[PDB]
Amino acid sequence: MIDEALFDAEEKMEKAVAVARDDLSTIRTGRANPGMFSRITIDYYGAATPITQLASINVPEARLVVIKPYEANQLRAIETAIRNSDLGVNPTNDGALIRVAVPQLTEEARRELVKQAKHKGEEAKVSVRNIRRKAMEELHRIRKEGEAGEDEVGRAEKDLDKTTHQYVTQIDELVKHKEGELLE
C-alpha cells in the first residue's frame, strides 16, 4: 500500500536525520560536548567499552570538561584513553575527577574537521536517498500492477519527493551548523 511505503519511508528518514545529528556531535569543536569523547574506548574487563558508559561527562566552562568515572579503579585507564586519543587534549588528574581543558583548534585541524562534517552529511543524504528509492520503487510496483490509481500514485510520488528533500536539507543545515561551529 501507498501508506505503508510512504509513512514508513518518512519515519526512516527522520531516524536517518537523527543519526546524522548524533554523528555530527562526535566531531571535536570549540564548545566541547560529550560527543567528542563518545568514541574513546577503554579495556573494560575484556570488552572494548566507550568512556561515555563508564563516566559522567560534565561541561562547566566553555573550554573545560569534567569527567567523573563511576569506578575510581578505572580513572587512570580513562585519562590515558583521552590522552592517547585524537582530540588533541592534555588531561590532568584531580583524584576523583579528570580535568580536561580543551584547546582552540588549529586552522589546519578545523579545515580537516569541516571536511569530516561534510562527509558525515554526504553519508546521511545517500542513506535518505536509498530510503526514497525503496519507497518510490514500491509506488512504481503499485502502479505497474494496478493496485492503486495513476493520479493517486503520482500524488504520492510528489509527496515522497517533498519529504525526501526536506530531510536532505535538514542534514545540510545540520552540517552548515557544525561548519560554523568549527570556523569560530
Task: Spell out the domain ranges in the chain.
Answer: 1-30+106-184, 31-105
* Stretch (H or E) spanning 19: helix 2-25
Cα–Cα distance, 153 to 172 (Å, whole number): 29
Q: Which experimental approach was used here?
A: X-ray
- Same topology, domains 1-30+106-184 and 31-105? Answer is no
Torsion angle, CA of 75/43/37/97, rounded to 10 degrees?
0
Task: Domain 31-105: give its CATH architecture.
Answer: 2-Layer Sandwich (3.30)
Locate breaks in the chain with C to N over 2.5 A; list the residue preceding each. none
**How do 92-93 and 55-58 pair as beta strands?**
unpaired
* Stretch (H or E) spanning 39: none
What nine digits make up the cell of 105?
583548534
Burial per residue of 10-46, b for 16 or more beta-carbon CB atoms within 10 angstroms, e otherwise: bebbeebbeebbebbbebbbeebbbbbbbebbbebee
**Which residue has cell 570549540?**
30
Query: Resolution of this entry in Å?
Result: 2.3
CATH superfamily of 1-30+106-184: Ribosome-recycling factor (1.10.132.20)
Cα–Cα distance, 184 to 180 (Å, whole number): 7
Going by C-alpha positions, the residue among 157, 124, 162 that lies closest to residue 22 is 124
Residue 142 CA: distances (Å) to CA of 138, 145, 163 = 6, 5, 19
Q: Name the maximum alpha-carbon separation found in the chain.
A: 71
